[PDB]
Design an enzyme around this catalytic site. Structure first.
Site, mmCIF file in Angstrom:
data_model
loop_
_atom_site.group_PDB
_atom_site.id
_atom_site.type_symbol
_atom_site.label_atom_id
_atom_site.label_comp_id
_atom_site.label_asym_id
_atom_site.label_seq_id
_atom_site.Cartn_x
_atom_site.Cartn_y
_atom_site.Cartn_z
ATOM 1 N N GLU A 82 -16.262 -120.106 0.238
ATOM 2 C CA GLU A 82 -16.710 -121.407 -0.212
ATOM 3 C C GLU A 82 -16.978 -121.639 -1.571
ATOM 4 O O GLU A 82 -16.353 -122.885 -1.934
ATOM 5 C CB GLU A 82 -17.969 -121.834 0.742
ATOM 6 C CG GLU A 82 -17.877 -122.053 2.177
ATOM 7 C CD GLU A 82 -16.998 -123.078 2.552
ATOM 8 O OE1 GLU A 82 -16.866 -123.944 1.941
ATOM 9 O OE2 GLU A 82 -16.473 -122.731 3.666
ATOM 10 N N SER A 95 -16.358 -137.261 1.299
ATOM 11 C CA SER A 95 -17.622 -136.514 1.179
ATOM 12 C C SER A 95 -17.297 -135.192 0.271
ATOM 13 O O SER A 95 -16.113 -135.117 -0.389
ATOM 14 C CB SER A 95 -17.594 -135.858 2.764
ATOM 15 O OG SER A 95 -16.631 -134.798 2.777
ATOM 16 N N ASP A 112 -12.115 -138.057 3.013
ATOM 17 C CA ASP A 112 -13.337 -138.534 3.975
ATOM 18 C C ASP A 112 -14.191 -138.972 3.003
ATOM 19 O O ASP A 112 -15.531 -139.493 3.267
ATOM 20 C CB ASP A 112 -13.625 -137.984 4.955
ATOM 21 C CG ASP A 112 -14.613 -136.699 4.781
ATOM 22 O OD1 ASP A 112 -14.416 -136.167 3.716
ATOM 23 O OD2 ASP A 112 -15.381 -136.203 5.776
ATOM 24 N N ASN A 147 -21.622 -129.429 3.512
ATOM 25 C CA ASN A 147 -21.323 -131.159 3.304
ATOM 26 C C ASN A 147 -22.092 -132.259 3.346
ATOM 27 O O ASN A 147 -22.952 -132.092 3.995
ATOM 28 C CB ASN A 147 -20.016 -131.119 4.500
ATOM 29 C CG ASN A 147 -19.051 -132.254 4.222
ATOM 30 O OD1 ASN A 147 -19.488 -133.299 4.870
ATOM 31 N ND2 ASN A 147 -18.164 -132.204 3.375
ATOM 32 N N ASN A 149 -13.726 -133.804 -1.148
ATOM 33 C CA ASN A 149 -13.000 -134.299 -0.117
ATOM 34 C C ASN A 149 -12.519 -135.466 -0.457
ATOM 35 O O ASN A 149 -12.954 -136.514 0.418
ATOM 36 C CB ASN A 149 -13.216 -133.818 1.218
ATOM 37 C CG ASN A 149 -14.172 -132.457 1.231
ATOM 38 O OD1 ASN A 149 -13.213 -131.344 1.287
ATOM 39 N ND2 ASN A 149 -15.329 -132.238 1.333
#
Length: 130
Positions: free
Chosen positions: A35, A51, A49, A60, A46
């Site tokens: 990660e 986020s 969307d 997230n 991202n």
């Protein structure tokens, strides 16, 4: 902060992550590696969307923390996403624990499915004394 492998392993064990909701410490290490590369200030936007994934565990903003700019989002961890960018990972660990209490468990992160599931993850903790 960029953690060294065994330094992080020892830290997570002290924070009660070994076996939390059936998840071994080795799996948590594998997640952090993919990660963020063990980097606490890592962020991934991202565009799809709108986020953002925050911190060492890539938590997230649509469901776990509030950044005020993510559409139709919630804040299940009751934290500002800013808390997930500190060198002290206590808040990030508390929030990761919350994420895995939901049905999906560790599977909530697609990176764990692609890079850790059904693999030999012993390598992430070997030689750390945990």
């Amino acid at each position: 902060k960029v953690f060294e492998r065994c330094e992080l392993a020892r830290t997570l064990k002290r924070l009660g992550m070994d076996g939390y909701r059936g998840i071994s410490l080795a799996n948590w290490m594998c997640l952090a590696k993919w990660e963020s590369g063990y980097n606490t200030r890592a962020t991934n936007y991202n565009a799809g969307d709108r986020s953002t994934d925050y911190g060492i565990f890539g938590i997230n903003s649509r469901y776990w923390c509030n950044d005020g700019k993510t559409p139709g989002a919630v804040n299940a961890c009751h934290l500002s996403c800013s808390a997930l960018l500190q060198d002290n990972i206590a808040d990030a660990v508390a929030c990761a624990k919350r994420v895995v209490r939901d049905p999906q468990g560790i599977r909530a992160w697609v990176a764990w499915r692609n890079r850790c599931q059904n693999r030999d993850v012993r390598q992430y903790v070997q030689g750390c004394g945990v």
